[PDB]
Each structure stands twice: as C-alpha cells, then as structure tokens.
Amino acid sequence: ARVLLNIHGTGDTVVLALCDEDLLGVELKYKGRTLHISEPFYSGKSMEPDRAAKKIREAVQEYEDEKTVAINALGELACSVVVDAGLAREDEIGELGGVPHVQMYILPREPFLEG
Amino acid sequence: ARVLLNIHGTGDTVVLALCDEDLLGVELKYKGRTLHISEPFYSGKSMEPDRAAKKIREAVQEYEDEKTVAINALGELACSVVVDAGLAREDEIGELGGVPHVQMYILPREPFLEG
Q1: Which of A26, A52, A62, B44 is the most buried (most CB within 10 A)?
Q2: In which domain of life is the source organism classified (chains A, B) (predicted)?
Q3: Which domains are delineated in chain B?
Q4: Which residues contact B27 (CB under 8 A, 6 or more apart)?
C-alpha cells in the first residue's frame, strides 16, 4: 500500500510526482496510448498514503507563492492522495492507460505590492 | 558568456531551465517580492548559448509525443537562447525584476496513427 513521491525543483517550477508503487516498470495501453512506467520518470520515496498527502500539502504551501507547482499522479492510490491532500476532487481525476491519472498546475499570480 | 541549463524529467513533465551564469546566487526584487536565484533551483550545466539552443531544440523534439515540456528562462542570454531555438519571438519575452524572463508550456502532440 505504497505510493512513490518525487519532488524536484527546477528553475521556476516544482514538480510533485506520485506513482502507485506497483505500477513502476509496467507498460500500460488503453485507447491508443502506450505508456512505460520508467524509473527515471516514476521513481520516488515509497510512503504510505496518509504520509504522502501530508508531504504534498506541505510542499504546496511552501511553494505556491514563489514557484509554479505541477502535480502529476498516476495510479488509484496516487490519485486518492491528491484528493486527500485537497488538491483535486474525485470527479476531476482522469485516466491514462486504463489507470487513474491527474495532471494539474498551480500557476503563480502577479505580485501584490500593497500585499 | 555562459548560460546554465538544468533539465529534469519527472511524472508527465520535463523542465528545461536556463539561467544566465552571472545571475546565479543573486537577489531580484520586483513589486515587493524577493526572488532568490538559488543554487538548488538554478544550477545547470554551464554552456555556450549556441550549444544551449541546440540542446533545447533536441529535448523539445525528444518529448513532443510523451511529456509536457515546461521551459523557464531567466536572463538576457537565457531568453536569447529560447528565441534562437525558434521557441519564442523576441517580443514574447517577459521580464522579472528588470531581468528578461520567459515561461512556456509545450504540451505533447495529440495522438495519431501511421499506416
């Protein structure tokens, strides 16, 4: 019952990527989409759901004002974490390869000088 | 005359970040904000603009059917790299703290079959 969490800051942008641990390595095909669940893209720290949702909430609060935040989530467990973090609703979860998927941005606002 | 190129792929996302080398470790103030051009976020392979443009071109073609490519460039030389790669028009370049800045999201091509 493990999800892999990968957080990497590159320039302006922080990517928070989650993959159900058991999906790693697998090849998915569904509706004309071929997807290899590769180590370089999908690896991360294996944690429990509750623990990933905590860390994901924490990363967003820390970053959302300075950096673009991209959330990518692949897998049923990974997408429930994004839901439990309050980042999406169960009905805005999509699919990819016949597996739940979410791909979201938190884009930054112009800054408020009197703010 | 050198630009830092930092490329990292995670989840559905490849970030290509470019920064003028002489900007690394500086602080930029704009409308009450403080941008720290910090080593963890900005710290790439140091290269000559023409070589950076070539690598940027190649990574964009590499991921065109597979990932979203997010580009962030900070500095005069870095933005000129984005222009010289054919990725942005000179007039599209923004600025951030009196320093040129561009952010771009290049989503993958819609899927197609070949006979």
Answers
A1: A52
A2: Archaea
A3: 1-107 (3.30.1860.10)
A4: B34, B35, B36, B37
Answer yes or no: do A12 and B103 touch at CB < 8 A. Answer: yes
Asked if residue B114 lies in contact with residue B82, where contact means CB atoms within 8 angstroms, the answer is no
A6 vs B6, B10, B40: nearest CB: B10
Q: Which residues from chain B sit within 8 angstroms of residue A111, using beta carbons? A: 30-33
Of A72, A75, A12, whose CA–CA distance to A41 is shortest? Answer: A72
**Contact A37/B at CB under 8 A:** no
Cα A55 from Cα A70, distance rounded (Å) = 15
CB within 8 Å: B8 and A10: yes
- E strands, A62-115, are 68-74, 94-96, 99-106
Name the residue among A88, A81, A83 with its Cα closest to residue A106: A88
- List b or e across B95-115, with b for residues whose CB sees 16 or more CB atoms inside 10 angstroms: ebbebbbbbeebeeeeeeeee
CA distances from B52 to A28, A68, B2, B58, B93 (A): 34, 23, 9, 10, 17
Helix (H) or strand (E) holding A47: strand A45-47
Q: What is the separation of C-alpha B91 from the centre of its chain, rounded to a whole number of angstroms?
A: 16
Mutate to test the interface with B, among A5, A10, A66 (most CBs of B within 10 A): A10
Q: How far apart are the first and last CA of chain A?
A: 43
Residue among B64, B56, B105 at smallest CA distance from A104:
B105
User: B27 and B70 in contact (C-beta within 8 Å)?
Assistant: no
How many whole angstroms separate alpha carbon A10 and alpha carbon A7?
10
